[PDB]
């Protein structure tokens, strides 16, 4: 076949406008642009298509794209059929189309990307979900699912209201179970609500899923820290099965001298204040946040990028301080580029040695060690090696973004639950834990991973719960 090698671009807000707020940067496709991009797809056979193999839940990508092309003149029918196809495998397309690292997944595998730009699969998936939401087409398909529910009288508890728990709950409700989700924070959504900022994941997208859960008859109980507010044994007595979707929500903190100086935040604290508590709207909202004139963000993943771009929106000069080079960074390529555009400064091959304070206990500077690249490590990326050369760089604020890990406090209290040395719940091939009738998925079993894997695990666990309780 002949290939159209250039992607149809999605429009984005200007840098000058968007650094003044937390609104979504990328405006997504219109119908006309989405159809043009869909036309670039070569329609590889489903039983071969490499994009399908690269999607962790194997969405029928050529199929949903074909549904758009075959309905060129009826966008509502096109979107309805495309969304039906997507929903066979993915509950959260408006989210995953925005946040998957597609260059490592579907798009990285697309044949067109070998000679030009891969099909913009994530933006097409996003377009289908967004258009459907704006036109009530998703509600149509959901009401169709709701009609088919046959209540079975059995009760299942979900611990945690992130993508894994929300997805598991919806699938179980469709199977007829009476589902309750218990969530420790005052709003559900997990990382989707407190971690990923509105400039790439608008809260409306998460709230839509909560509305869907309301319509499906799922109950959500916020302000419930399972292990304290309700015990695990109380849940086992009341429920026929339990799904643990508690994520990896504790910050990794390295024992750098000076890490408790004022002006040093974990990324989780900084992002929770910004995103969940709306501290960027202080004093309209009551939670404060404080950035100085110069902010350092330690790390190179999505968390680091989100913290850096949030701090920039508060008016600071912001530096990413990352111990490898650009090539090794793990954040989504699209968002690294957005950070560069917005004016985040990058320093590579550096790692902190200590944080330096003034007399009042406030951060004044960071002593950094220079690194050099060595042999590839287990991830296939060249490892950072310290050179012994250090220097001091002045900063007023620092945000630590070196990863997150599960909360062992919760986990140790769960009687009978087997957990590995990294805090991951051990599960069998059916996502069942060491406790019969208790299942787990998402970051709680993987460590920090992706939204799409958490969604996929929620669906797999729902099917396993159904099998377990049906036998």
């Amino acid at each position: 076949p002949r290939l159209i090698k250039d992607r149809v671009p999605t429009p984005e807000r200007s840098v000058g406008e968007r650094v003044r707020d937390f609104g979504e940067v990328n405006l997504g496709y219109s119908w006309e642009l989405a159809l043009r991009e869909a036309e670039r797809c070569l329609q590889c056979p489903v039983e071969y298509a490499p994009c399908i193999k690269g999607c962790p839940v194997h969405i029928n990508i050529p199929g949903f794209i074909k549904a758009l092309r075959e309905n060129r003149d009826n966008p509502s029918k096109a979107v309805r059929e495309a969304l039906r196809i997507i929903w066979r495998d993915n509950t959260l397309p408006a989210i995953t189309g925005r946040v998957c690292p597609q260059e490592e997944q579907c798009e990285g595998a697309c044949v067109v990307g070998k000679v030009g730009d891969p099909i913009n699969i994530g933006k097409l998936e996003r377009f289908v979900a967004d258009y459907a939401r704006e036109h009530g087409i998703d509600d149509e398909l959901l009401l169709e699912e709701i009609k088919g529910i046959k209540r079975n009288g059995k009760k299942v508890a979900i611990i945690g209201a992130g993508p894994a728990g929300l997805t598991c709950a919806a699938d179980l409700a469709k199977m007829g179970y009476e589902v309750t989700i218990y969530e420790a924070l005052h709003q559900p959504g997990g990382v989707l609500i407190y971690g990923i900022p509105e400039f790439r994941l608008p809260k409306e997208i998460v709230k839509k899923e909560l509305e869907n859960l309301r319509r499906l008859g799922v109950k959500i109980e916020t302000n419930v820290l399972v292990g304290k507010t309700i015990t695990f044994e109380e849940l086992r007595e009341e429920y026929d099965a339990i799904f643990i979707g508690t994520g990896a929500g504790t910050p990794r903190i390295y024992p750098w001298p000076g890490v408790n100086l004022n002006g040093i935040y974990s990324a989780n604290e900084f992002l929770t204040r910004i995103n969940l508590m709306k501290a960027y709207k202080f004093p309209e909202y009551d939670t404060p946040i404080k950035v100085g004139k110069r902010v350092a963000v330690i790390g190179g993943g999505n968390t680091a990028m989100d913290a850096a771009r949030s701090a920039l929106r508060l008016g600071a000069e912001v530096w990413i301080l990352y111990r490898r080079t650009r090539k090794e960074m793990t954040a989504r390529e699209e968002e690294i580029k957005h950070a560069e555009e917005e004016g985040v400064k990058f320093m590579f091959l550096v790692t902190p040695k200590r944080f330096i304070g003034d007399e009042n206990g406030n951060l004044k500077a960071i002593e950094l060690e220079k690194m050099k690249l060595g042999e590839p490590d287990e991830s296939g990326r060249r490892r950072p090696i310290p050179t012994g050369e250090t220097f001091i760089m002045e900063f007023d604020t620092a945000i630590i973004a070196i990863g997150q890990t599960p909360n062992k406090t919760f986990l140790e209290t769960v009687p009978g639950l087997k957990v590995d040395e990294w805090g991951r719940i051990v599960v069998d091939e059916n996502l069942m834990t060491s406790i019969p009738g208790v299942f787990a998925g998402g970051d709680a079993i993987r460590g920090e991973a992706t939204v799409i894997l958490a969604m996929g695990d929620g669906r797999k666990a729902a099917k396993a719960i159904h099998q377990y309780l049906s036998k």
């Binding site: 420790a184 924070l185 304290k228 507010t229 604290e269």
Partner: protein, 279 residues
Amino acid sequence: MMFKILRKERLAPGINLFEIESPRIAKHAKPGQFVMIRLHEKGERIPLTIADVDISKGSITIVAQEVGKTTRELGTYEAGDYILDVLGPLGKPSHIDYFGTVVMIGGGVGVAEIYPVAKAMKEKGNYVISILGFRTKDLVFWEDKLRSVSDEVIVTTNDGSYGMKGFTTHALQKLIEEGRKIDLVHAVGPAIMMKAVAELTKPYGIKTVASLNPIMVDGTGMCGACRVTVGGEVKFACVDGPEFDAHLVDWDQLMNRLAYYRDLEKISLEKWERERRMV
């Protein structure tokens, strides 16, 4: 849903008690534990100690001293109003062992905070001496309530207007200098008070536990806002404490961290006051 206020009692100027409907928290709460609350959709999350529980009513009791915007706004709430969010019980319960003679020291609103701990200590067979610290006579509250769970009560006022003149630490130093047997000191109050208690008892080798009061956001271990240095190691007070060995706590670091948002706290309070001037 939200959390109904069953009862409000003004215990002293700026010290407001709230009994809140929360049967899950009441069923599980133990002395020393706390809650996070948020009043309304624009609010911040703040920690407050579980000062009492009533399982038969399904209620918990919190006592909030007016010190800034959120606690002043809470002080205006009435019975039948609702606290939007109440998360609990949080933290590790106080460790209640038979120690011998236990000196319980509450400063200001800390007097309400020590009540359940004093009660549990007494029920375990300890001889309980409660030292209550207030600035002045009109701030004294819960003397009889603490006396009901103590063998001895010493009330202090900074200005000598009621009880013994001086600080909590003056009463404690008097006990030590009299040669009284003291096996454990527990302190709850302002960080400056807990630091002073710790520094007084350290040369005497008296085991001292303080319930730390750092800045909190989630209260469940997710963020480190509440971090402290204990014995040279970083701990998160909301999940690892909030009680620690007072002699191992970096008190200057805690007080530095508690001061970080002072300017913004003032801006928020000033806005609330400015927007309530017309009547």
